[PDB]
Amino acid sequence: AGVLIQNMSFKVGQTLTITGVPKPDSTNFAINIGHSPEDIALHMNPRFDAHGDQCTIVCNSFQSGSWCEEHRDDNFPFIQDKEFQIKITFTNEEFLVTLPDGSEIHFPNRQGSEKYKYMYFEGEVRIQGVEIK
Ligand X SMILES: CC(=O)N[C@@H]1[C@@H](O)[C@H](O[C@@H]2O[C@H](CO)[C@H](O)[C@H](O)[C@H]2O)[C@@H](CO)O[C@@H]1O
Binding letters toward its own copies, positions 102-131, x by CB under 8 A = ------------------------xxxxxx
Exposed / middle / buried, residue 112 (Cβ in 10 Å: 0-12, 13-18, 19+): exposed
Sign of CA dihedral 118, 88, 86, 77: positive
Asked if residue 49 binds its own copies (CB under 8 A), the reply is no
Closest CA to 63 of 11, 109, 111, 7: 111
* Contact between 45 and 68 (Cβ < 8 Å): no
Q: Which stretch binds its own copies (CB under 8 A): 1-9, 26-34, 48-56, 69-77?
A: 1-9
∠ Cα 60 71 84 (to 5°): 80
Asked if residue 58 binds ligand X (CB under 6 A), the reply is yes
93 is in an annotated binding site: yes
Q: Which stretch binds its own copies (CB under 8 A): 4-12, 43-51, 69-77, 98-106?
A: 4-12
Q: Which stretch binds its own copies (CB under 8 A): 5-13, 40-48, 63-71, 93-101?
A: 5-13
Asked if residue 5 binds its own copies (CB under 8 A), the reply is yes
